[PDB]
Write a protein that binds this ligand. Structure first.
Ligand SMILES: NC(=O)c1ccc[n+]([C@@H]2O[C@H](COP(=O)([O-])OP(=O)(O)OC[C@H]3O[C@@H](n4cnc5c(N)ncnc54)[C@H](O)[C@@H]3O)[C@@H](O)[C@H]2O)c1
Ligand SMILES: NC(=O)c1ccc[n+]([C@@H]2O[C@H](COP(=O)([O-])OP(=O)(O)OC[C@H]3O[C@@H](n4cnc5c(N)ncnc54)[C@H](O)[C@@H]3O)[C@@H](O)[C@H]2O)c1
Lengths: 496, 148, 496
């Protein structure tokens, strides 16, 4: 087993590290500590760079640095007066913020990092500090809150006005990491601090596809939050996301990675799980970039033979849903490519004219939404598009055999997405679908109930709450009341 | 009102007890009192405490054994007790030196920095461990204002 | 069995004690009684100090002193005019207030102790009397009432203005013991007597970590009482609790204790049981210090092999709950460390974005909240985050198999904590969660019901009681009425 060779690599690197660390335990002065820091920096950079699963070796070195001497002597050097020592300390620290190391500096001396966040001028320091902040924003919600309440976020937002590649790359990743981990409270602060605007120059960059791609992930994650959505639109930065995502290739990462069991790239389950709600979002931009990242990961994971993860992260049904109800090529290409890389069967995009479906379309749709257990019942009862759009809970329970109330609740959840997607040209003379959708996007699903009773924009002013309940099938009272209210207010248009 | 009436300045090593006691005895008298809670592992730096001095009406200095040692030859103004007292003079706050029963100002008056040395000439209260409420009443007299 | 050697230790110490006691039965005058008191004081101090389970020997001596001559001759000497005799009596008594000895002096001559509580000046007496009062506050609710109604509490609150280490240590422990045993009535009196302020200098002390730690326990216990909470906040003393608890190490006590069956430290089940409601409290400070003390005990008990106690004190589920819904590092570290010392499996902190959970998160959460018996049903019915947040009693009973109404009541109790913890960024455009939470913290759980019906801050003014019941699922009428009332009053904001 190759793991033995990793122990050999560790048994080489560890005594060298012990020597280099011991050569920092003495207060040797600026020259001596500069050299000692450069030695450990070299050792751990070399460890990261190993094709022979360098991540494991380097993690072992980061563990050794945590166990012996600790991050403590680094955090002391990080605030020593001589710039060289601070730079060398920051350089080293930025390369060793593994999870447990983040976990330590989150509780010891985080205030030191936020002190350095004010030293914005020296670029070698700035690069290192930005990378540190990036890593620390990946830690926890609390850590993000602390970094955003004090000057930590202000540092990366300031540094977005600089030209330096490494600094900007760290800024993009910092803002993305912050948005993905900081929870509801800090997302709101980021947008209030105009982070969406400050991501614009990084997204609009030329030289580096990954600077653009990281900046785009940040704004996509922010736009997935419904409260801040309107302001991140206002920044204009979302307009860059689809054009970029259409330009790049997901296969790139899986060929930056080498063959066999190379683990130098690839997100863990936590880091993957955070992408899935981008697929589930209503934003086209977030669905595109989420499908991009998850397709890149599908390439990496399929090469590594680690495809199991997507099935319980719940990525698979989400990608199948993107393909099914797709109205956009860029998104569809990525999602289909992802499903193929994962060796899944790929769904046909479903015909939008639901009222005209026959039995065979209903059978197809049931298979895509994962109700294939019910296909036989729907076939035997001969459900077609008109019957499907009008299924009541009673029929679903009694005639089709869907006993479980929770299962019916999931079926109606699916059916409501179909109703909302559907084309009603054969039914709706008065474009009542758009009228409903103009009140509230989630009202558009009631179109076929209204028009099937024979209502229309002219008639609607006369409808009663009981008719919306009984005839048209709008079960929620709040929805009935809003539709009904708007229908009275509309009367200035039917009167002429 | 969110603002403190009184800010308490104390040397972190030796002043904490008498500072806490004065803080409590004034808080019980209904004064809104600020003390920096600075004595912990992370107690390196916080400029905002100078803004707390600026927010206060009155400034108490808890003059205590070995307290003023950090002032001596501090021409650089490195010391927090120096910075605190300096801020109080710069904003001309009502400054109230309270002396522990054992306290005396250093004989090395020239080594006390030029920007704060006048503290040695300010009137103040000699605290006595047995007569705490009487001492506190005398401090309340100083809280009426004496911009020496 | 080592217990035999304890009998040998007793068979040595007891005749020496009989001699020393007999040398106090005669009215020998100040010099003779001073010596006799010093002899018994030495004997029982020596007994406490024995590494060979000194507590058992010393309890046997305290029993012997209760049985022969009694506390009665001590209580007579305790009020003799000569200060030396009172000091020596108080010194001895303070070292022998074992449970049964407290039980005796609670019913005989408690008034003598409260008489001494006025002799506040002589420090040797004050130390001893404070220790006596501390022990007596540990006795019963009635004893606390008596000590607080008369000058007993006033003595310790006065002595908090002194400088003496031993005196202050006893004052901290007295106020803590009083808060933990005195019940609702005396807690209210302590706070009215400004006890929270007078704990400040002891919490803000420098030289002694345990003086700070005992003072912090006192204010944490007081802050757990909802009526007095606002005043103990007002004292500012709570601000000291987390910074202190973050500074110390729970392992300290278990290394002050020696190896093997050392019983010189460690709380009994009663003393442990009183800490658990600190974990269950809403106060961050009380949860921190409760987790601190209970982690220290976990170290001691695991060393002693006595881990059974935590499982039926109900500490285990409470610690698992602190980890699960954690939003604070200091608390989480202590709780995880405690669970590891007790050899329990440690829960992963749960993802706050409940609406985005898939099946695997639901299965994880069910295991943490101890509903693992239902995991199979929730898996088979494919419950995910949206379905979980919307489970009605009917579904829970019929579809998931949760037959027992009491079990459903516990499930909803759990689910309500999750709903209250959750992040609704993907759902709530209008930050209706904060609006609900600004009326009442326990209303925030209704967020997903409101927003899932499509209400929002602008619309809410039009909602009706029936819609809050039927659509949004707010079952309690009082909650409906308050939400609805506030929604009408809000109308000055939707009108513009
Ligand atoms: N992670 C690396 O491969 C890598 C490469 C070069 C430099 N560094 C430096 O080391 C520190 C830690 O890197 P990070 O912040 O990217 O880490 P991270 O934990 O935030 O992310 C590392 C990625 O590797 C995966 N992974 C799985 N098992 C791992 C293991 N045993 N060790 C490491 N990663 C594992 C994680 O799931 C994740 O996708 C940082 O300061 C960074 O600058 C790390
Ligand atoms: N309890 C001691 O170990 C100890 C140590 C030195 C002095 N003293 C003195 O003796 C008196 C009694 O001490 P206390 O007030 O802390 O007692 P306490 O009963 O209030 O607390 C003693 C602790 O030991 C535990 N314990 C369990 N079995 C015990 C036993 N057989 N004997 C003693 N403790 C047992 C209790 O559960 C509790 O956690 C006090 O006046 C005190 O000053 C006792």
């Amino acid at each position: 087993g190759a793991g033995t060779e990793v122990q050999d690599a560790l048994e080489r690197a560890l005594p060298e590290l012990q020597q280099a660390l011991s050569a920092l335990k003495q207060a040797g002065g600026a020259r001596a500590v500069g050299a000692g820091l450069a030695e450990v920096f070299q050792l751990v950079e070399e460890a990261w760079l190993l094709p022979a699963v360098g991540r494991e070796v380097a993690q072992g070195l980061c563990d050794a640095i945590r166990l012996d001497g600790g991050l403590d002597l680094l955090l002391r050097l990080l605030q020593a007066p001589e710039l060289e020592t601070r730079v060398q300390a920051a350089r080293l620290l930025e390369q060793i913020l593994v999870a447990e190391n983040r976990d330590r500096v989150a509780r010891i001396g985080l205030g030191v990092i936020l002190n350095l966040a004010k030293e914005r001028e020296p670029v070698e320091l700035a690069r290192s500090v930005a990378g540190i902040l990036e890593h620390m924003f990946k830690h926890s919600e609390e850590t993000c809150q602390r970094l955003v309440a004090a000057g930590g976020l202000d540092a990366v937002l300031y540094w977005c006005r600089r030209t330096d590649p490494a600094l900007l790359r760290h800024c993009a990743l910092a803002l993305g990491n912050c948005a993905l981990h900081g929870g509801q409270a800090v997302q709101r602060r980021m947008v209030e601090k105009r982070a969406a605007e400050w991501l614009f120059p990084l997204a609009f960059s030329k030289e580096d596809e990954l600077l653009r791609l990281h900046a785009c992930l940040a704004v996509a994650v922010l736009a997935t939050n419904k409260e801040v959505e309107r302001e991140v639109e206002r920044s204009g930065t979302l307009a860059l996301v689809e054009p970029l995502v259409a330009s790049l290739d997901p296969g790139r990462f899986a060929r930056c990675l080498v063959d066999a069991s190379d683990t130098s790239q690839g997100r863990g389950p936590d880091d993957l799980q955070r992408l899935v709600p981008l697929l589930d979002s209503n934003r086209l931009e977030a669905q595109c970039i989420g499908a991009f990242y998850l397709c890149a990961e599908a390439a990496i994971k399929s090469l590594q033979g680690k495809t199991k993860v997507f099935s319980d992260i719940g990525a698979i049904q989400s990608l199948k849903r993107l393909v099914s109800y797709s109205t956009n090529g860029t998104k569809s290409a990525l999602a289909k490519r992802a499903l193929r890389l994962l060796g899944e069967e790929v769904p046909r995009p479903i015909l939008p004219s639901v009222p005209s479906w026959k039995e065979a379309e209903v059978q197809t749709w049931l298979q895509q939404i994962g109700f294939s257990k019910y296909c036989e019942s729907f076939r035997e009862q001969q459900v077609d598009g008109d019957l499907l759009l009008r299924l009541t809970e009673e029929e679903l329970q009694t005639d089709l055999g869907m006993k479980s109330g929770i299962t019916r609740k999931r079926f109606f959840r699916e059916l409501t997405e179909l109703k909302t997607f559907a084309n009603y040209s054969t039914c709706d003379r008065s474009n009542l679908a758009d009228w409903l959708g103009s009140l509230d996007p989630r009202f558009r699903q009631y179109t076929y109930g209204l028009v099937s009773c024979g209502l229309d924009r002219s008639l609607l002013h006369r409808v009663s709450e009981q008719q919306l309940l009984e005839d048209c099938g709008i079960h929620l009272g709040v929805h009935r009341a809003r539709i009904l209210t708007a229908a009275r207010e509309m009367l200035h248009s039917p009167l002429p | 009102g969110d603002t403190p009436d009184v800010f308490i300045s104390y040397r972190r090593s030796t002043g904490n007890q008498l500072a806490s006691l004065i803080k409590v005895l004034l808080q019980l008298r209904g004064y809104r009192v600020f003390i920096d809670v600075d004595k912990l592992y992370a107690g390196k730096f916080d400029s905002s405490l100078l803004k707390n001095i600026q927010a206060a009406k009155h400034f108490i200095l808890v003059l205590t054994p070995n307290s003023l040692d950090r002032l001596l030859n501090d021409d650089n103004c490195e010391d927090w007790v120096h910075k605190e007292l300096k801020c109080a003079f710069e904003h001309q706050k009502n400054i109230i030196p309270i002396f522990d029963t054992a306290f005396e100002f250093p004989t090395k008056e020239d080594q006390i920095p030029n920007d704060i040395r006048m503290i040695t000439k300010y009137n103040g209260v000699k605290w006595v461990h047995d007569y705490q409420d009487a001492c506190m009443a005398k401090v309340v007299r100083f809280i009426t204002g004496e911009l020496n």
